[PDB]
Design a protein around this ligand. Structure first.
Ligand code: LYB
Ligand code: LYB
Ligand code: UMP
Ligand code: UMP
Lengths: 264, 264
């Protein structure tokens, strides 16, 4: 995608060298923002093939409030194997905070349902927010959230969303994260009878790992293809009733895939 | 300053008409990012004079972990009066979450101390974050945090900071907020023998109130003037024991102030 490739070249041109938690070494820029008008098409990178199956199953996984990789395994998705423990648990990550953020006084807040109610009865609210950044449970998480905070907004019957990603593996993570949220927006929109608007991505520590430099130049030498189309064949009773088959991506003809190591 | 005036112009040109909770109405856009290189001086607006004692006392008020506006009175600061109860409390707002995020099991987390230590022992960390968006206590707050999530970043000995502001009153609040954090960055840098870097401001619902049109137009026709320079007279033994006297801005020659009503 143009925005994607332009970001890559931005890291290579202004990035500074930094060591990191994984001892892998990176090229890093701090603070960036890009927009995707969802009506121009589904933002799934084409300069290299992406695995839809993984992207979609991970989202339904989050929405169910699951934090164990069993479900993912049942559907052949292994993107979260490296961090799960003996029992498949990852700790109170994304899914848990999204559906059951534990308050001090013994309550649990379902942020996803809260947002839906807000989009239907108070769409002008400047507080339609979902946060995975639960300071209290950060130490029980196998990995601190990367896409940590996001906000919805409405205008002219169009649903928009901004995500703040504090850490971003540009080559390996960004492609999945962008598609994942663009997908949520379509789901939210369809449930609230709104049209899709913009998906605004904002990054904190945006980087390219040292052992991703070749792959990066390879991909950066290719011409972006036309964006695919997302077709939802059904309208479930609730945001929690979507299934893998309700989705259908049309016109996805991407360049060849490129492989790279996953910094653990 | 140019960035500020441009964003201000953008709101008028692209803004959408919305009916907010105050019932005043606004002109707003969603998703915007500004960058301030602190090497070029304090980003305190000059196209309009800004009350600096209230920006400094508020910030220091936060750092003490205080939620009651008593302290602010002691020093003639009346920016948080239209939201305090009979006792003057605002709820576990900013200060409370920064200094003592209450966990589900009784313990408390000091995000500021945590950050100070991350900056001194693990500067490459991509998790140097402090959040005020404690979902579990939003209902107990007089007003949900506007500047709710910020991240620190280190590179080439420079300390940068990105702020996520979900809601922004471009005319009244944006000037104060910007300077407030720019100020913090300088305090953090001094306590960690680091140089100041960039301050990146990112906004969610960025708006201009209907009854600010005149004041805005008046400000847009004035020319920006060289940014001032922040001077920190002494160096406290901790980031917590700073004082109003310790700060001094130099070269601040702003245009006259502009009076305007605040939306409650
Ligand atoms: N430092 C990082 N650490 C993290 N921790 C968690 C994350 C985010 C989640 C994540 C995303 C992507 C990867 C990743 O590693 N991403 C690779 C491999 C994807 C993958 O699993 N790809 C799959 C592809 C499988 C496949 O082609 N199946 C076909 C077979 C058809 C026949 O055969 O006939 C089918 O059935 O459709 C795999 O390897 O299993 C990629 O995107 O290329 C890992 C984690 C990150 C991150 O971002 N970066
Ligand atoms: N809908 C909104 N709701 C909010 N809730 C919280 C906020 C953010 C905090 C906030 C910022 C700014 C104002 C505001 O209302 N901002 C005004 C008035 C500021 C002020 O207190 N201005 C002061 C100015 C006092 C002054 O001029 N002092 C001199 C005297 C010198 C001589 O005499 O010789 C001196 O000593 O330096 C005041 O009048 O109290 C402004 O900037 O114009 C209110 C709240 C907001 C917001 O943004 N908008
Ligand atoms: C985390 C999860 C995700 O969805 N997408 C991402 O880009 N990542 C990346 C960020 C970083 O490269 C690593 C997490 O490391 P750290 O917690 O920032 O130290 O995975
Ligand atoms: C909140 C506090 C701050 O420091 N900065 C701001 O600009 N504001 C503004 C945003 C908005 O105008 C109002 C809060 O309203 P809401 O909670 O967003 O509905 O104060």
């Amino acid at each position: 995608m143009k925005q994607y490739l332009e970001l890559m070249q931005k890291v290579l041109d202004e990035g500074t060298q930094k060591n990191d938690r994984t001892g892998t070494g990176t090229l890093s820029i701090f603070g960036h923002q890009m927009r995707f008008n969802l009506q121009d098409g589904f933002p799934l990178v084409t300069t290299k093939r992406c695995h839809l199956r993984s992207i979609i199953h991970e989202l339904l996984w989050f929405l169910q409030g699951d934090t164990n990789i069993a479900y993912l395994h049942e559907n052949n998705v292994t993107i979260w194997d490296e961090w799960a423990d003996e029992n498949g648990d990852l700790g109170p990550v994304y899914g848990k905070q999204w559906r059951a953020w534990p308050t001090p006084d013994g309550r649990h807040i379902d942020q996803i349902t809260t947002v839906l109610n807000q989009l239907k009865n108070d769409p002008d609210s400047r507080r339609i927010i979902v946060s995975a950044w639960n300071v209290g449970e950060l130490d029980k998480m196998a990995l601190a959230p990367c896409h940590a905070f996001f906000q919805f907004y409405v205008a002219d019957g169009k649903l928009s969303c901004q995500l703040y990603q504090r850490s971003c593996d540009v080559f390996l993570g960004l492609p999945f994260n962008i598609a994942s949220y663009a997908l949520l927006v379509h789901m939210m929109a369809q449930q609230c009878d709104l049209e899709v608007g913009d998906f605004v991505w904002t990054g904190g520590d945006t980087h390219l790992y040292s052992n991703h430099m070749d792959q990066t130049h390879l991909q950066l030498s290719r011409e972006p293809r036309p964006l695919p189309k997302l077709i939802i064949k059904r309208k479930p009773e609730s945001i929690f009733d979507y299934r893998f088959e309700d989705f259908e991506i049309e016109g996805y003809d991407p360049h060849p895939g490129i492989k790279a190591p996953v910094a653990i």
